[PDB]
Ligand binder design. Structure first.
Ligand SMILES: NC(=O)c1ccc[n+]([C@@H]2O[C@H](COP(=O)([O-])OP(=O)(O)OC[C@H]3O[C@@H](n4cnc5c(N)ncnc54)[C@H](OP(=O)(O)O)[C@@H]3O)[C@@H](O)[C@H]2O)c1
Ligand SMILES: CCc1nc(N)nc(N)c1OCC1CN(c2ccccc2N2CCC(C(=O)O)CC2)C1
Length: 166
């Protein structure tokens, strides 16, 4: 349903090579270069996230500055300030390039509607654990390109993949 709307809908996430995106209510690695990449791609745009991701943000970073923060929840509203709440992904997207920034539940809702995915792969050894949030799997409707492996100042290797709907 990526052509049920006019504005581009992009998913953006970072994952380990094993496909983990979240653990224990947070992200189980630190990668400053990915944060800068995420900031450059999203600055000045609407960012849409699930409520658990909203609550996972450290207070210094909530709301994400310089972006319209939209939080998808079934609740009437939120205790933590700075978001616009909506009750569905469709309400998040219209009116409106909108970035869906996680987590796994909101990626699953948005994947059928998305035109683009921007993935950072982090070469950190994290065998998936029972409660982990995992990255969405991309099917045959996506075409991708991949950048070279880069080395972070902290020593972790990482790289970016970019997918567009065929
Ligand atoms: N690595 C990355 O790039 C990345 C990015 C973002 C997040 N994360 C990680 O992902 C994890 C959180 O992901 P998650 O999947 O547990 O949660 P999530 O997708 O962030 O949020 C789930 C919440 O969204 C709301 N929601 C879900 N489906 C809905 C629907 N159909 N209609 C309305 N509201 C709906 C509900 O909020 P209510 O309960 O309020 O109703 C639900 O509890 C954390 O570990 C976080 O650190 C990682
Ligand atoms: C940087 C992590 C990330 N990476 C890619 N590639 N995709 C994503 N969806 C993604 O999750 C973005 C959300 C979760 N985040 C976060 C989590 C923990 C500590 C700091 C942050 N934030 C605060 C605001 C900063 C900003 O000003 O942008 C960015 C870092 C914002």
């Amino acid at each position: 349903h990526h052509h049920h709307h006019m504005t581009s809908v992009g998913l953006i996430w970072a994952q380990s090579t094993s496909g983990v995106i979240g653990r224990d209510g947070g992200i189980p690695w630190r990668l400053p270069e990915d944060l800068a990449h995420f900031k450059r791609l999203t600055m000045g745009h609407t960012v849409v996230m699930g409520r658990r991701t909203w609550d996972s943000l450290p207070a210094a970073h909530r709301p994400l500055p310089g972006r319209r923060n939209v939080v998808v929840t079934r609740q009437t509203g939120l205790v933590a300030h700075g978001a616009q709440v909506v009750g569905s992904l469709e309400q998040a997207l219209s009116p409106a390039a909108t970035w869906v920034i996680g987590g796994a539940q909101i990626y699953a809702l948005a994947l059928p509607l998305a035109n683009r995915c921007e993935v950072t792969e982090v070469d950190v050894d994290l065998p998936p654990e029972d409660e982990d949030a995992l990255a969405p799997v991309l099917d045959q409707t996506w075409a991708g390109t991949s950048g070279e492996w880069l080395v972070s100042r902290s020593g972790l290797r990482y790289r970016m993949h970019s997918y567009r709907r065929l």
